[PDB]
Amino acid sequence: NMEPFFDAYRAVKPFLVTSGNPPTKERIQSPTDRARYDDTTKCILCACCTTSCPVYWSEGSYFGPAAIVNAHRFIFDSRDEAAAERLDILNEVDGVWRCRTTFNCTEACPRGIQVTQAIQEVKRALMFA
Amino acid sequence: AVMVTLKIARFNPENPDAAGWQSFRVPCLPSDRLLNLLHYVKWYLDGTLTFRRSCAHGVCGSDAMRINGVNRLACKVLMRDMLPKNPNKQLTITIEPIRGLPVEKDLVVNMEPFFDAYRAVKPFLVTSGNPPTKERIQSPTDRARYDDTTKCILCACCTTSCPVYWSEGSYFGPAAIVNAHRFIFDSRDEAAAERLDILNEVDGVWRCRTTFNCTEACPRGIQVTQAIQEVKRALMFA
Amino acid sequence: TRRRTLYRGDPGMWSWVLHRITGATIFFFLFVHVLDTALVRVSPQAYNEVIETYKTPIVGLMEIGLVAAVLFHALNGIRVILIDFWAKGPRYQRQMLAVIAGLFLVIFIAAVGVIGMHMVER
Amino acid sequence: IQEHRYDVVIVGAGGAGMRAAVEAGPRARTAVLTKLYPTRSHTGAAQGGMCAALANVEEDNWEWHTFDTVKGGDYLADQDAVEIMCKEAIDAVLDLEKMGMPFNRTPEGRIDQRRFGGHTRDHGKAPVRRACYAADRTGHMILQTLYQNCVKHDVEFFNEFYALDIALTETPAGPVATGVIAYELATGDIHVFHAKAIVFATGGSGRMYKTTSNAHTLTGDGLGIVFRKGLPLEDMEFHQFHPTGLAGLGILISEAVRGEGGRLLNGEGERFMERYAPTIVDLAPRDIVARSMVLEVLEGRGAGVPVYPTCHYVMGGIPTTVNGQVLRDNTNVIPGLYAAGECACVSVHGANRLGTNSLLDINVFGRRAGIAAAEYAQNHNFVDMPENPAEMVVGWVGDILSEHGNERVADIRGALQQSMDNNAAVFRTEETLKQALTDIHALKERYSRITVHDKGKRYNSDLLEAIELGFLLELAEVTVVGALNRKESRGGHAREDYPNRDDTNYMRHTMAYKQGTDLLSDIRLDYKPVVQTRYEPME
Amino acid sequence: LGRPAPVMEREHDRPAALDHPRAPRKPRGIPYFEKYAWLFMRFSGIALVFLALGHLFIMLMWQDGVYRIDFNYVAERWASPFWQIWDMALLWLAMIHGANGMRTIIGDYARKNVTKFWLNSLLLLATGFTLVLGSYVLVTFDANIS
Amino acid sequence: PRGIPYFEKYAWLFMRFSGIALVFLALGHLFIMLMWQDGVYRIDFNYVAERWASPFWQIWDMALLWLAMIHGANGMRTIIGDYARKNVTKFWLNSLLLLATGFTLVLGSYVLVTFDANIS
Ligand SMILES: Cc1cc2nc3c(=O)[nH]c(=O)nc-3n(C[C@H](O)[C@H](O)[C@H](O)COP(=O)(O)OP(=O)(O)OC[C@H]3O[C@@H](n4cnc5c(N)ncnc54)[C@H](O)[C@@H]3O)c2cc1C
Ligand SMILES: CCCCCCCCCCCCCCCC(=O)OC[C@H](COP(=O)(O)O)OC(=O)CCCCCCCCCCCCCCC
Ligand code: HEM
Ligand code: HEM
Ligand code: HEM
Ligand code: HEM
Ligand code: SF4
Ligand code: SF4
Ligand code: F3S
Ligand code: F3S
Ligand code: FES
């Protein structure tokens, strides 16, 4: 039953939040800001990662590697206006601080995404900000 | 006619990025302001010189610039009681853009940081939802509470003289806090709590190091730091 | 690029610069004072040694400078506290600054006179 | 060249522009273009109150207001428009107050009012205390309130966009306005905003006079655009000359003499307004006070704080209807083209503006034009676009940039302003107006060869100063030919050659059409009848 | 040809979308911590006037200034509850005051968030070291050390 | 918003920093105790009394006690949060942990601060 997985997914607000009057001509973004949230745009949402996380087998409600990957994608996107709100979602008791730095997720991903390095970058964005 | 020397900090954004001061000689009658001499420069001698100015004398706040060190709003520099009128000798006036905002051309800066900080303190009236159709009542002594912060022309002579604004981080600035005081201390408003919660962060009102550069720079005379104090007191006695 | 600009603003600005500088001076000195005083738990002779080396004319001039730092910090901090608490504070700023200039002058010349007498009689 | 697609496009972010934006923002997808920042606009220079018949400290109905407006206009206003203005003025002031505006309060605390100028009790009896106010700064508060509301409703602002042209695509049933060609000051790019409706709120044009009170940025560009497209301009020879004007330079003193017993003394320690107008010593209409001052300084009984009349307001502009639609005949209407504010001539003020009616005007008719344009945009659909509409503007900018003539824009403009303030000022004559016509034709042939010394692209203010001088020259010739046509003395337009109102031949609005395309062209003059409901002329 | 787009990425660890122009500014720390650090600087300054200036007076100006100070002088002063509590309050108030002040100084002179993090860590380390060393010396002092 | 804001970030950072310190503290303790002269076979009251007559070892042991107990208590807080299924069980287990940790810190601090060599 993939609905717990997808509920955790659509709880990090995995969509672009923006102003309210679009620019009619594809708001600009550098080829340098674009290559930053790359490598997390490859997620096919298979759950091979979240269902190998011992922290996910445990109690409470850990979000999971996949939700954190698909939130990294939007936190490190220049043309977004809810990075701080997403980082505040991931900064709870059951957010990104429950990762016990097991690399089960990285080992299991079929696209080769470096799931735990994405988690590390979110952790460091919460430390240094 | 006295033939003042103006030393202007030039900057061409495109053709050369290698330029500093330039000195122009301009005649100066005693009934002049600095905008008249800047106009003489731009019309006759130079013409690459680009500054902002709108009004005749109904203050709009366009031409804040750094004159002889201080933020002075050129149209008001009064150019009349020259102390070197006592010893006959060369005069110089040093002109450059205001500090803290990115320069777009010589004396024209980018005011979008200033206005983005202004419209982040929710600078508009928020009320309940049943408009009385009859001119919401307010005492003549509730009126005089938020007065003196209704004179802000949004020129950034205050914000661009705050050392805390020159520093790192993202300080709101004196002008955002003036325009938030205007609404926090309004009787017919229903959002004082959320505005005081906006101004109660690390980058909010506790970064004022109680320098009075803002009060000294404002061309309307607003007592900017007294406004900041009243916001601090409303926040600590709560 | 970087330009060198003196802003030439209010005197409260220079009060704040001096406040910041003197406060950091006291902080670093206090790190050192607390170490050399911790030396009192090892022996009498070690403490006596290091403080006998703290009784020279150079360190006497330094102690005068530290008196100046602490005095100005305390006085301008009283001014800052009054500005923040007293509801007529921001009006009378720049009169508090003259008051504390005068107070610093009298207390500092008295203290430097006493300390200079002590340093002479040796 | 960039392309944008919006439902409603407002050109101007002053009082009328930001009022129309407040209204048409929720309805449609609106944009606002400004050559300034919204709060840098002339409206903020307004100090006098805003008049409305609220009757909080006294008693008045809007009918006495309507009569006083009609009589102040010297019987050239339109009574339907005056009626609408007053009976919507009450609710205009109330909605400003309910949007957040800090009016001064009365001992109870509703709204305080004060007496002002030529406002009467009922048909010329006594002061009535109509004018609301906020402080010595009323226009500044109105502008701040409108801008704070545009921030609340998240309006899109295109700051520092000099709208240089409009695109009228000719449908078989007439012309229709589709787009606005603008020039981004910051980058040098041309933008084309294709819209369904277009609102023009670009304020007045008083900078063709040396001694004036208007901003440095009030050259008159909505009027110049609409006049170059072939549409008409109405009643442009009616300029109001404020009496108190800092005899040296031109700044306004609207505060002191109105408020307290400031007596206007001439040379000798002598008052004159008591002999030029009894029944009121010096609170007479502004046109009368200025004629008196000019007459006495001319007859040799003046000096040499001093004052002198300064051009203050233009009562003409783009001819519209009470809903804002721009006319193209005396009857027809350009589909999808509205106008509000000081550029528009609904003919509320007629031949002389009564103080504190301008802020009223801009509120009422900016709201009307906003809702009208929103309705039009939500009803109709995008029409078309001509072949590369920016072709004329890009060629114009390119060819005014690309060569090195031998004239100075500052010299041409100074000559124009000196000539106008010498000849086409408070007192006009046939010989002086002909002299000014020859002067303006000479300057129009000199303007053909000017030098923009910048040649850059990032922030090119010299280019735009030359472009604005073009508009100044067009509007100057319109004013002079209108004032040479009207052989009477009504309101702001006085003529020493025919010094008495001719109610039988010249009680009509003058309308001017441009014939050619280049600067030197012909001005054809037609007439438009003035509407009348109840009030009839009387000396 | 056009103008290349501006890069919004300050440093690698900084989400550019954090300094978006239209992004809502919301508090980035513990709520009501700044209010109480501000109030602490005020109150601890009021106390430190007396503590620090009385310390300086009694040390430098009373009898023979520094030229009387040695181990026996310290041991006679710290045999009194008055001076023991005075020096403990002085140590704690002065170190917390100075450490919060240098927190502010670092916060507005450090350009990068990594520099800010590591300088705040060094500051907290140095302040903790000085506090535990001073507290140890005060609590566990005995005049008969030799 | 389930607990105190920013408490988890600082508990995380504290585990890292206390680990860096506890490397030296705990491993130096174990070395000097077990493999310096005779290991445990030299330890007695006189050994403890001559070690705790030194500011170095006194501060070493107090820092070791406090860092080790707060480190372990935070780690066991995490373990309880990951293994306790009922909210009542989690509440009472966190309370038992807090009680035992407080008791151990109080007893160790008392012993260090009050130890006197001459007791009998
Ligand atoms: C000194 C002074 C004092 C006054 N005092 C009073 C008073 O007390 N009471 C009173 O009733 N009236 C007064 N008036 C007149 C009154 O303010 C005007 O009728 C009114 O302000 C007109 O404003 P507006 O909204 O039409 O446009 P304005 O406020 O005049 O400004 C026009 C706006 O349109 C935009 N714009 C203009 N041209 C272009 C272009 N080419 N491209 C793009 N954008 C453009 C600009 O951004 C500008 O903000 C005064 C006028 C002056 C000059
Ligand atoms: C949050 C951070 C908290 C920090 C706590 C960690 C502490 C871990 C252990 C450190 C113990 C320090 C106490 C020192 C007592 C001591 O050594 O002194 C005790 C020593 C006995 O040491 P031994 O018996 O082990 O040989 O007595 C001596 O004879 C020493 C001779 C001279 C030593 C001078 C030291 C005085 C102060 C200088 C401190 C040096 C630090 C420099 C920093 C810039
Ligand atoms: C020349 C100036 C100074 C001298 C000679 C001096 C001397 C001393 C002495 C003699 C002692 C301990 C002895 C005792 O307490 O009786 C001491 C300790 C102490 N001093 Fe100073 N002092 C000076 C300045 C300062 C300053 C400016 C501060 C604080 C800003 C300060 C704060 C302290 C503290 C907190 C202690 C306690 C040390 C500890 O607890 O280990 N002293 N210093
Ligand atoms: C002696 C009496 C003292 C008083 C009255 C006092 C008062 C103050 C006040 C009110 C501030 C806040 C200033 C501001 O926020 O603008 C401050 C800042 C500061 N204090 Fe003190 N203080 C005293 C002593 C000390 C001591 C003993 C130290 C260090 C050991 C110290 C170090 C600092 C530092 C570093 C700052 C930061 C300066 C700044 O951020 O601008 N002060 N002081
Ligand atoms: C075989 C291994 C160990 C032995 C034989 C041992 C022995 C001792 C001894 C002899 C003392 C007190 C005497 C002194 O400190 O000089 C002591 C105290 C202490 N030890 Fe250990 N220890 C061992 C392992 C550990 C470990 C693994 C830790 C922590 C991870 C630890 C933490 C402490 C602490 C915190 C104290 C302070 C006791 C107090 O303050 O009451 N020890 N242990
Ligand atoms: C008295 C000594 C120690 C005690 C009682 C202790 C206890 C614990 C416990 C119970 C945990 C929880 C493990 C988990 O949550 O999976 C933990 C975690 C940890 N320990 Fe220690 N430990 C000690 C010494 C050390 C030392 C010497 C280091 C050296 C670096 C260290 C580094 C860490 C780190 C980094 C963690 C966090 C692990 C994680 O978050 O995944 N610890 N400790
Ligand atoms: S495994 Fe790789 S792909 Fe499958 S979900 Fe986790 S991240 Fe997305
Ligand atoms: S406060 Fe005074 S200075 Fe600061 S902006 Fe408003 S007006 Fe300009
Ligand atoms: S599998 Fe689980 S706990 Fe951490 S690194 Fe990967 S998430
Ligand atoms: S300039 Fe800056 S720090 Fe305080 S009082 Fe004025 S704000
Ligand atoms: S030009 Fe408007 S304020 Fe100087």
Residue numbers in the entry:
A (entry chain K): 132 to 260
B (entry chain B): 23 to 260
C (entry chain C): 15 to 136
D (entry chain A): 2 to 305, 347 to 581
E (entry chain D): 11 to 156
F (entry chain H): 37 to 156
Sentences from the paper on this structure:
Complex II is both a functional member of the oxidative phosphorylation pathway and the Krebs cycle, thus linking these two energy-harvesting processes. Members of the complex II superfamily are identified as succinate:quinone oxidoreductases (SQRs; or succinate dehydrogenases, SDHs) or quinol:fumarate oxidoreductases (QFRs; or fumarate reductases, FRDs) according to the preferred direction of reaction. No matter the direction, SQRs and QFRs share a common architecture with a large soluble domain and a smaller integral-membrane domain. They are comprised of a soluble flavin-containing subunit, an iron-sulfur cluster-containing subunit, either one or two transmembrane subunits and either zero, one, or two b-type heme groups. Diheme-containing SQRs generally perform menaquinone-linked succinate oxidation, a thermodynamically unfavorable reaction.
Here, we have identified a 3 kDa subunit SdhF, which has only one transmembrane helix for its secondary structure, which is located near the transmembrane helix I of SdhC. However, the equivalent QP-binding pocket in M. smegmatis Sdh2 structure is completely blocked by the SdhF subunit, making this site totally inaccessible from the outside. Fifteen phospholipid molecules and six menaquinone/menaquinols are all clearly observed in the structure, which is in agreement with MS. In the present structure, cardiolipin (CL), phosphatidylethanolamine (PE), phosphatidylinositol (PI), and phosphatidic acid (PA) molecules are mainly distributed in the cleft in the transmembrane space formed by neighboring subunits, playing roles in mediating the interaction of subunits within protomers of the assembly and interactions between neighboring protomers of the assembly. The bound MK/MKH2 interacts with the side chains of Gln-D94, Ile-D95, Met-D98, Trp-D102, and Leu-D103 of transmembrane helix V in one protomer, and the Val-D142, Ser-D145, Tyr-D146, Val-D149, and Thr-D150 of transmembrane helix VI in an adjacent protomer of the assembly.
